[PDB]
């Protein structure tokens, strides 16, 4: 339960150049930057990450400026991941959450495939009410209608692939856009048919915005990939939300 010495030395030569661009030669900004971005993870991204240790080092950086607090809370690694992408994907909500409580995570940045930390929720079962309520915060501070740049899917559509109840059920609570449109298409009711989420399919279903005539690039409603996928039990729940003239 000690503060990092190697990461605030080089906390400090990366302040300098936040302050002024011309401060550091093109080698010692290489090595701020890379050591700022390994004792970092190092602290935040272990699997026995501790979250006050976390929250330590977060009040430390605030006081040295505001700008390195910024810097550091949202460093990336070669793959455009930030802590938040791992401390998510690991699902180690109290490190997420002292991580949101900073005021500066930049909470819709897509990495290398284009996934936020809000979509990447999809990776990860919420076990306890506080984890449901981190997830909550998470989803009130950023964007979880964006699109992936990979495919245009969005975190719902991820969570329904992945058979993620407790997710599914956190987005819609936020109001979560349902009738997004993935690039071939697709909803996430047409996922959860094609799959045969029967659970998911009811929470979308009773959303009343749920607009189950959509089709996608082949000209398939969620009822149709359905009754293609031989799940009959989802259809009947979509028969029962249509009105056939």
């Known amino acids: 339960m000690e503060l990092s010495p190697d990461l605030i030395s080089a906390c400090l030569a990366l302040e300098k150049y936040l302050d002024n661009p011309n401060a550091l030669t093109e080698r010692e900004l290489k090595v701020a930057y890379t050591t700022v971005l390994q004792e970092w993870l190092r602290l935040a991204c272990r699997s026995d990450a501790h979250p006050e240790l976390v929250r330590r080092h977060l009040v430390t950086f605030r006081a040295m400026s505001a700008r390195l607090l910024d810097y550091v809370v949202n460093i990336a690694d070669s793959n455009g991941n930030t802590a938040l992408h791992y401390s998510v994907s690991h699902a180690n909500f109290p490190v997420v959450q002292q991580l949101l409580d ?141 009105n056939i003239k």
């Open 102 to 242: 900073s005021g500066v995570c930049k909470v819709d940045k897509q990495n290398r495939a284009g996934y936020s930390p809000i979509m990447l929720t999809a990776l990860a079962t919420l076990k306890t009410q506080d984890d449901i309520e981190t997830v909550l915060q998470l989803f009130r501070l950023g964007n979880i209608n964006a699109k992936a740049s990979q495919a245009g899917q969005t975190a719902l559509m991820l969570a329904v692939s992945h058979g993620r109840v407790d997710v599914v059920k956190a987005l819609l609570a936020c109001e979560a856009d349902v009738n997004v449109q993935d690039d071939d298409g697709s909803t996430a009711l047409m996922c959860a048919c094609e799959h045969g989420h029967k659970e998911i399919a009811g929470l979308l279903l009773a959303v009343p915005s749920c607009d189950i005539s959509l089709t996608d690039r082949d000209g398939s409603t969620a009822l149709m990939v359905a009754l293609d996928a031989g799940q009959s039990e989802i259809a009947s729940m979509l028969y029962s939300r249509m």
